[PDB]
Amino acid sequence: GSHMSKAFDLVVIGAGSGGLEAGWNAATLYGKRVAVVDVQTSHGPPFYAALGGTCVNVGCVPKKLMVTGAQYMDHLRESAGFGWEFDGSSVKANWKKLIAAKNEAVLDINKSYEGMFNDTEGLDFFLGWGSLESKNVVVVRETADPKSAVKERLQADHILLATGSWPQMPAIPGIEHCISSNEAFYLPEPPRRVLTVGGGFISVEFAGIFNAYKPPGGKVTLCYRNNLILRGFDETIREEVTKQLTANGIEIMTNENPAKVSLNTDGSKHVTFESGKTLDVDVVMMAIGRIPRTNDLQLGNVGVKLTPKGGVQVDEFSRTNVPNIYAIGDITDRLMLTPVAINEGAALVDTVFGNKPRKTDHTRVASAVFSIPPIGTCGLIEEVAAKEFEKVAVYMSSFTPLMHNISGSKYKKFVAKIVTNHSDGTVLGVHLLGDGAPEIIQAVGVCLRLNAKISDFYNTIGVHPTSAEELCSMRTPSYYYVKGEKMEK
Amino acid sequence: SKAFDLVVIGAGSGGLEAGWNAATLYGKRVAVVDVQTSHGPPFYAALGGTCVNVGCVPKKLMVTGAQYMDHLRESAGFGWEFDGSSVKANWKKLIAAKNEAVLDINKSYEGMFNDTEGLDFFLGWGSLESKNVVVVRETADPKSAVKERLQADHILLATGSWPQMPAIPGIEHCISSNEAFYLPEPPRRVLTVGGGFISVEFAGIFNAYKPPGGKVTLCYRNNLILRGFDETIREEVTKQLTANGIEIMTNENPAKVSLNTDGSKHVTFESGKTLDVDVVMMAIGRIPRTNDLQLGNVGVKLTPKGGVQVDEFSRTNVPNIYAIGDITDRLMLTPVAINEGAALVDTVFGNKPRKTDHTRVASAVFSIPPIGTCGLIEEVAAKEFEKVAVYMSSFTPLMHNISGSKYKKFVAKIVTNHSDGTVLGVHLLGDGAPEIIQAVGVCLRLNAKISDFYNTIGVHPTSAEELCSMRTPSYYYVKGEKMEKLPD
Ligand SMILES: Cc1cc2nc3c(=O)[nH]c(=O)nc-3n(C[C@H](O)[C@H](O)[C@H](O)COP(=O)(O)OP(=O)(O)OC[C@H]3O[C@@H](n4cnc5c(N)ncnc54)[C@H](O)[C@@H]3O)c2cc1C
Ligand SMILES: Cc1cc2nc3c(=O)[nH]c(=O)nc-3n(C[C@H](O)[C@H](O)[C@H](O)COP(=O)(O)OP(=O)(O)OC[C@H]3O[C@@H](n4cnc5c(N)ncnc54)[C@H](O)[C@@H]3O)c2cc1C
Ligand SMILES: CC1=Nc2ccc(Cl)cc2[C@H](c2ccccc2)N1Cc1ccccc1
Ligand SMILES: CC1=Nc2ccc(Cl)cc2[C@H](c2ccccc2)N1Cc1ccccc1
Ligand SMILES: [Cl-]
Ligand SMILES: [Cl-]
Ligand SMILES: [Cl-]
């Protein structure tokens, strides 16, 4: 006869930044029975993400290590200025060694998270592909093909969709000759010539990475379809980052977009842009965007509605149009950042299972770009602020620090900008570029949630000598926007 | 002509801020006096002050130089390969690059005087002749040729401080940090005497630039270095200096230093223990530089400590004579002195009176690895508040597991008044700590609570995000008593 399905208060689809924080909190804080589904228990091909999520397996965590590795190129050169001497012709960047180090580090996190499943009562992990068979039934199948064999049918009171996002690949001829960030983490050799396609943080970060590790006579090229990389970021910074990448030897192609790629005789790639221009490279890494990973969930089975862009539509509390079905993290197409997914999962579990309804605040969120040098930022850019306030003030400091006069890296301009509501002094945004920018910016996030005014920044006594003390020496606006237009008046 | 709205004795952090605000923001006629136009022997400090010439600015460059000892080694873990045995640390190169950068700052400060109307600079030694007279003499000797007398509406004392040298026999064979900046070769064996930030910072510099077989020793007369800093961090920095080869000799104080014929120094400690070194750098404290001012001539009051006494608005007992900066023997920090000077000018020549806030001042120690701190340490908090909670996070970041520097724990601590959640102090150890703390200083002006920190979304991956991931206290103090759990 028949026998019982395994049953849960909460089934989470995707063992990532957001779904792990939800699953953990529901099990350990509210004594719920939780199932969590993911397609792999450790990182890498075939599926790249795995137990742990995108950040842990193929984003924030391995990239940062790789960016840190890339920084030694600068450090070794800059040390001469302080008197370090050594045989410069003996220097070699060993990519294989970096990839192996990073692989070990990620696997340890993978194993560690599996151990925490094994050790936590009421928190179960399920290996495979999850989808919605009906409103309270989650099936887990062998592969993403909806006709592959069912492994388990889970009864679920509540279902959380947290499958994250996936790299956008444009439908152009030869797209199958390109890679994404996923494969970039697994290249067996460092590419000699690479094109990173796109202007966002992922394209920019990997360009620096590839730039540090490329072999003899290699060349890194980045293309973006518009005028100026890093759309969404402060404008001075977009321009500074452009020049500083260039200065470190990276070719920026603005106003270009690939129209197709063919394979050369020798296995390299021959890229033709929309403009008629061409470029031959060993690697084409597409990083033009990430799209909500919804295709495998079978949402039609239950009528979960999407937005026009393709994300799962949700209210401020992460609820879908179907009761007992929720969605958080990249699948919702808000801010695609790990600590927002984390914050979203926690808020959702407080709301549904705790006694503290709460909604995630998506404004004033701090974030970074680990370019070399990095960007740290929190809040509104000046052109956004000008459109929402009658009188905006901009304070700006920008100078090559002294250490970098001695180091020889003179192109390294530090930029600090504070954007105010000039009617009351409220700080709306802070924008930084230069060494340590991502660390400086964290407590600025706390500042904005405290409705800090410019006078709070300037009244604070500086720590000397730092870059950060620039945020506390600015008293006079560099310029303003008055009902939409720039001046010093 | 020889009459000025303001005379500043000491062209330093505090004095030059005051000298510049008065002339540029108020149109006052200003005179500033200093002993030397650029850095170095004989007088070390000069135009720019201590920070520019023999303090924050050159030491930060030199600690920056010292960090490459770690960087070169840590690079192997990330796949970098080069001939380790060809590595050499060239001190003369470092000192020459430091000297050039500092000289550029002297020169550009000289430029701004020459180009600025009613801001005048005078070479020599300033002393108070009468209430509205400042004499500039040739040397620090009262009895040497007068160079100028300047009539002064208002007088600012900003002569700063000077290394304290204890009266032990053989003190004359020891140096201070002043000479340390100009050593022609890096010492092979060096004893840094003091538990405070100059000693600790210099110990890390010498440790990196030391020749083969060299050894750095730091000594401190009490049990634990960095008195005044977070206890966890004091212990943790101690272990990480030891892991990088520096010897920490606590509970020891030099009683005698004698000179070997080969030029080395033979140090006898109070314990009767002895040690031989090439250089003994005394960094046991810094005292207010008041001896050459001739304060007797007008009776400006000094505290039982040596410092010019002042009220909150930098006023001495002699009307129209003010004191700011290390001469006041309070917080000896460049940006404080700068704040004091500007607040004083706002008060004397401006609209609104203004007083410097001495509480919640963020500061750093550029040790390797470095410290960033703002506000109260827990044991001081436990004396002023009935329930205090401590949130702590301490672990070796992942980059240092790959780097091979496993000993490098990052420490983050928040101290609250547990009754209302107000953040009383934050204390940090690890790469980035001086940069991370700056904006914490602002949070504390805004009376931030622990929940304001925890509710802010992290920037990931950073060390700083650790400040925004703490919601459960690690331990507490109740009525001064340390305990893990609250009692009820
Ligand atoms: C290259 C790169 C670098 C990044 N760097 C940063 C950074 O520095 N800082 C930062 O904050 N963010 C960074 N991010 C973003 C961050 O990774 C995401 O915002 C975050 O992981 C989203 O969390 P999530 O909970 O939405 O989903 P994820 O963490 O992506 O988890 C989704 C999981 O679901 C699994 N899954 C998918 N479909 C199914 C299915 N049908 N059944 C079962 N399991 C399924 C996937 O395997 C995956 O493990 C980066 C992203 C990338 C690609
Ligand atoms: C090694 C070292 C490292 C330091 N690092 C830091 C740091 O990292 N961060 C920080 O905030 N602080 C640091 N400091 C402290 C900082 O330098 C001082 O707090 C600051 O410079 C004090 O400023 P001041 O205005 O009181 O006078 P100073 O900057 O000390 O200026 C005093 C000036 O007066 C001159 N003078 C003295 N007597 C006379 C006279 N009678 N006539 C004419 N001129 C005279 C001297 O030439 C000197 O230029 C450091 C100090 C030292 C010694
Ligand atoms: C609290 C927590 N939240 C997570 C958020 C995002 C990720 Cl990718 C991982 C975790 C992690 C975790 C690990 C296994 C199962 C559930 C949660 N986890 C458990 C944990 C406890 C103590 C230290 C580190 C991790
Ligand atoms: C405003 C200002 N304050 C100082 C505080 C401390 C020091 Cl050590 C130096 C200055 C600096 C200055 C330089 C020459 C004369 C007076 C003041 N100065 C001038 C300046 C203007 C713009 C950029 C940098 C320095
Ligand atoms: Cl290689
Ligand atoms: Cl040398
Ligand atoms: Cl730092």
mmCIF file of C-alpha atoms in Angstrom, chain B residues 156-290:
data_model
loop_
_atom_site.group_PDB
_atom_site.id
_atom_site.type_symbol
_atom_site.label_atom_id
_atom_site.label_comp_id
_atom_site.label_asym_id
_atom_site.label_seq_id
_atom_site.Cartn_x
_atom_site.Cartn_y
_atom_site.Cartn_z
ATOM 1 C CA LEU B 156 48.966 81.102 21.023
ATOM 2 C CA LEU B 157 51.299 78.592 22.639
ATOM 3 C CA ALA B 158 51.606 75.485 20.358
ATOM 4 C CA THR B 159 55.140 74.154 20.978
ATOM 5 C CA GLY B 160 53.858 70.560 21.347
ATOM 6 C CA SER B 161 55.721 67.878 23.236
ATOM 7 C CA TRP B 162 59.124 66.075 23.460
ATOM 8 C CA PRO B 163 60.381 62.595 24.219
ATOM 9 C CA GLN B 164 60.621 61.792 27.886
ATOM 10 C CA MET B 165 64.083 60.400 28.756
ATOM 11 C CA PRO B 166 64.367 58.812 32.282
ATOM 12 C CA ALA B 167 67.301 59.843 34.515
ATOM 13 C CA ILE B 168 69.079 56.434 34.511
ATOM 14 C CA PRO B 169 72.891 56.262 34.264
ATOM 15 C CA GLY B 170 73.837 56.025 30.557
ATOM 16 C CA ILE B 171 70.617 57.645 29.287
ATOM 17 C CA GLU B 172 72.901 59.662 26.967
ATOM 18 C CA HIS B 173 73.711 56.506 25.008
ATOM 19 C CA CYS B 174 70.002 56.020 24.138
ATOM 20 C CA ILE B 175 68.035 57.646 21.379
ATOM 21 C CA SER B 176 64.416 58.713 20.966
ATOM 22 C CA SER B 177 62.081 58.329 17.974
ATOM 23 C CA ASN B 178 63.531 61.622 16.685
ATOM 24 C CA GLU B 179 66.911 59.998 15.990
ATOM 25 C CA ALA B 180 65.186 56.761 14.955
ATOM 26 C CA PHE B 181 63.877 58.564 11.812
ATOM 27 C CA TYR B 182 67.453 59.292 10.740
ATOM 28 C CA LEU B 183 69.489 56.177 11.559
ATOM 29 C CA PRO B 184 71.980 55.753 8.652
ATOM 30 C CA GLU B 185 71.726 51.946 8.828
ATOM 31 C CA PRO B 186 68.976 49.688 10.219
ATOM 32 C CA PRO B 187 69.934 48.324 13.608
ATOM 33 C CA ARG B 188 70.759 44.627 13.777
ATOM 34 C CA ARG B 189 69.786 44.419 17.435
ATOM 35 C CA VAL B 190 67.393 47.013 18.845
ATOM 36 C CA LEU B 191 65.664 47.505 22.223
ATOM 37 C CA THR B 192 62.510 49.569 22.152
ATOM 38 C CA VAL B 193 61.651 50.736 25.669
ATOM 39 C CA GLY B 194 57.948 51.458 26.318
ATOM 40 C CA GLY B 195 54.619 49.715 25.988
ATOM 41 C CA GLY B 196 52.882 52.558 24.145
ATOM 42 C CA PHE B 197 52.190 53.161 20.468
ATOM 43 C CA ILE B 198 55.524 54.738 19.393
ATOM 44 C CA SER B 199 57.518 51.775 20.762
ATOM 45 C CA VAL B 200 55.127 49.185 19.345
ATOM 46 C CA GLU B 201 55.023 50.907 15.924
ATOM 47 C CA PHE B 202 58.766 51.338 15.777
ATOM 48 C CA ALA B 203 59.362 47.727 16.854
ATOM 49 C CA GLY B 204 57.416 46.642 13.796
ATOM 50 C CA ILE B 205 59.387 48.923 11.451
ATOM 51 C CA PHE B 206 62.770 47.693 12.734
ATOM 52 C CA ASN B 207 61.555 44.117 12.549
ATOM 53 C CA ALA B 208 61.034 44.355 8.793
ATOM 54 C CA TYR B 209 64.179 46.306 7.853
ATOM 55 C CA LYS B 210 66.527 44.339 10.136
ATOM 56 C CA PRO B 211 69.638 42.718 8.542
ATOM 57 C CA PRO B 212 70.222 38.874 8.659
ATOM 58 C CA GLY B 213 70.314 37.403 12.202
ATOM 59 C CA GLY B 214 68.827 40.618 13.607
ATOM 60 C CA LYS B 215 66.421 40.712 16.523
ATOM 61 C CA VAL B 216 63.931 43.318 17.819
ATOM 62 C CA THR B 217 63.127 43.455 21.558
ATOM 63 C CA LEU B 218 60.448 45.585 23.115
ATOM 64 C CA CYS B 219 60.371 46.070 26.883
ATOM 65 C CA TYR B 220 57.626 47.327 29.203
ATOM 66 C CA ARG B 221 57.814 47.750 32.918
ATOM 67 C CA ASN B 222 54.349 46.275 33.518
ATOM 68 C CA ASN B 223 52.654 42.977 32.577
ATOM 69 C CA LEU B 224 51.024 43.950 29.288
ATOM 70 C CA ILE B 225 51.787 46.481 26.563
ATOM 71 C CA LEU B 226 49.339 49.076 25.128
ATOM 72 C CA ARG B 227 47.908 50.217 28.484
ATOM 73 C CA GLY B 228 44.645 52.111 27.766
ATOM 74 C CA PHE B 229 43.659 49.831 24.847
ATOM 75 C CA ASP B 230 41.242 46.936 24.798
ATOM 76 C CA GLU B 231 42.552 44.068 26.903
ATOM 77 C CA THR B 232 41.725 41.329 24.383
ATOM 78 C CA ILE B 233 43.570 43.402 21.728
ATOM 79 C CA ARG B 234 46.545 44.098 23.985
ATOM 80 C CA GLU B 235 46.972 40.339 24.480
ATOM 81 C CA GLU B 236 46.220 39.550 20.884
ATOM 82 C CA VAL B 237 48.667 42.140 19.382
ATOM 83 C CA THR B 238 51.352 40.849 21.744
ATOM 84 C CA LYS B 239 50.942 37.324 20.316
ATOM 85 C CA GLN B 240 50.993 38.539 16.715
ATOM 86 C CA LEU B 241 54.141 40.600 17.238
ATOM 87 C CA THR B 242 55.736 37.532 18.815
ATOM 88 C CA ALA B 243 54.624 35.456 15.811
ATOM 89 C CA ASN B 244 56.422 37.885 13.491
ATOM 90 C CA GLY B 245 59.734 37.484 15.379
ATOM 91 C CA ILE B 246 59.632 40.432 17.798
ATOM 92 C CA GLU B 247 60.547 39.624 21.403
ATOM 93 C CA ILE B 248 58.223 41.140 24.027
ATOM 94 C CA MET B 249 59.987 41.531 27.367
ATOM 95 C CA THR B 250 57.396 42.500 29.939
ATOM 96 C CA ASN B 251 58.007 43.227 33.653
ATOM 97 C CA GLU B 252 61.387 44.714 32.850
ATOM 98 C CA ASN B 253 62.796 48.242 33.019
ATOM 99 C CA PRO B 254 66.310 49.449 32.142
ATOM 100 C CA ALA B 255 68.200 50.661 35.225
ATOM 101 C CA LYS B 256 71.547 51.304 33.441
ATOM 102 C CA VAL B 257 72.917 51.561 29.939
ATOM 103 C CA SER B 258 76.612 51.458 29.206
ATOM 104 C CA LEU B 259 78.631 51.892 26.008
ATOM 105 C CA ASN B 260 80.798 49.083 24.699
ATOM 106 C CA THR B 261 83.982 50.129 22.948
ATOM 107 C CA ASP B 262 82.560 48.644 19.730
ATOM 108 C CA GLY B 263 79.680 51.168 19.937
ATOM 109 C CA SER B 264 77.002 48.710 21.017
ATOM 110 C CA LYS B 265 74.928 49.217 24.261
ATOM 111 C CA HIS B 266 74.904 46.972 27.295
ATOM 112 C CA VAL B 267 71.586 47.357 29.087
ATOM 113 C CA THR B 268 71.192 46.235 32.700
ATOM 114 C CA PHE B 269 67.580 45.873 33.819
ATOM 115 C CA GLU B 270 66.170 46.322 37.389
ATOM 116 C CA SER B 271 65.870 42.510 37.572
ATOM 117 C CA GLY B 272 69.665 42.342 37.081
ATOM 118 C CA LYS B 273 69.001 40.757 33.678
ATOM 119 C CA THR B 274 71.220 42.292 30.925
ATOM 120 C CA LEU B 275 70.976 42.623 27.125
ATOM 121 C CA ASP B 276 73.300 43.850 24.374
ATOM 122 C CA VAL B 277 71.903 45.797 21.455
ATOM 123 C CA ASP B 278 73.001 48.213 18.735
ATOM 124 C CA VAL B 279 70.315 50.798 19.541
ATOM 125 C CA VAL B 280 68.186 51.606 22.602
ATOM 126 C CA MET B 281 65.190 53.724 21.595
ATOM 127 C CA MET B 282 63.445 55.319 24.587
ATOM 128 C CA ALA B 283 59.709 55.691 23.942
ATOM 129 C CA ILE B 284 58.376 55.721 27.555
ATOM 130 C CA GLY B 285 56.323 58.898 27.161
ATOM 131 C CA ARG B 286 56.272 62.461 25.810
ATOM 132 C CA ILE B 287 56.193 65.578 27.954
ATOM 133 C CA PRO B 288 54.880 69.116 27.299
ATOM 134 C CA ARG B 289 57.533 71.340 25.736
ATOM 135 C CA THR B 290 57.362 74.329 28.061
#
